[PDB]
Amino acid sequence: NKNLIITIEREYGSGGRIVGKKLAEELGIHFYDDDILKLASEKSPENLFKFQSEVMRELAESEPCIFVGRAAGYVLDQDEDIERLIRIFVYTDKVKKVQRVMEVDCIDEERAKRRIKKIEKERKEYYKYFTGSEWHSMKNYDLPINTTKLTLEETAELIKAYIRLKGFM
């Protein structure tokens, strides 16, 4: 009900996750990502998903928090008990993404391109398989942010600009 829930999904190379981290700290909200949600599942891949959804909804029911990745926006959009859900998609030019991935993963240009194609494929297919909707589709979000010309900080503040407007802060 009351709790503020923010879901950030994103293009690989956008820094969506980092933007999620920053934002969790500056707001003091608990933070759950791909890995934590993955390891969570251990605490049929259609079971693994069902399990992971019920976990997501439980957290939300009992805390404010920020989820990153794994069709979190879809899942929580289904939960009619949640009132303060804000769904973000972070996206960016290839040129900027290749440079981030090159640096953050220490690979070259070619390798970086292939990685972006691959993780984005994974994210898209995951989403398609489980929601039946489309990961890269506006309709699935409240606010898609183009960070082509933003710092991750500006980006974080835009999300705060938003939480504030809604009166959730």
H helices of the chain, in order, are 16-27, 34-42, 45-62, 72-78, 94-105, 109-131, 152-165
* Least distance CB 167 / Cl ion (angstroms): 27
Q: Which 3 state secondary structure label does DSSP give 94?
A: helix
Backbone angles phi and psi of 38, in degrees to 5: -55, -65
Which one, 106 or 165, has the nearer CB to a second copy? 165
* Contact between 90 and 145 (Cβ < 8 Å): yes
**Residue 78 binding target from Cl ion, a second copy, none, CB below 5 to 8 Å by type:** none
* Least distance CB 77 / Cl ion (angstroms): 14
Q: b/e map of 91-105 (b: 16 or more CB within 10 Å)?
A: bbeeebbbebbbeee
Which one, 104 or 169, has the nearer CB to Cl ion? 104
* Least distance CB 17 / Cl ion (angstroms): 9
* Least distance CB 112 / a second copy (angstroms): 18
**Residue 149 binding target from a second copy, Cl ion, none, CB below 5 to 8 Å by type:** a second copy
Which residues does residue 4 pair with via DSSP β-bridges, in sequence order? 84
**Residue 139 binding target from Cl ion, a second copy, none, CB below 5 to 8 Å by type:** a second copy
* Contact between 84 and 161 (Cβ < 8 Å): no
**Residue 15 binding target from Cl ion, a second copy, none, CB below 5 to 8 Å by type:** none
Which one, 40 or 158, has the nearer CB to a second copy? 158
Spatial separation of the C-alpha atoms in residues 119 and 140, rounded to whole Å: 19
Q: Which 3 state secondary structure label does DSSP give 31?
A: strand
Which one, 57 or 136, has the nearer CB to a second copy? 136
**Residue 145 binding target from a second copy, Cl ion, none, CB below 5 to 8 Å by type:** a second copy
Which one, 103 or 151, has the nearer CB to a second copy? 151
Q: List residues binding Cl ion (CB under 5 A).
A: 9, 69, 123
Amino acid identity for residue 65 in this structure: C
**Token code pair at residue 37:** 């949600």
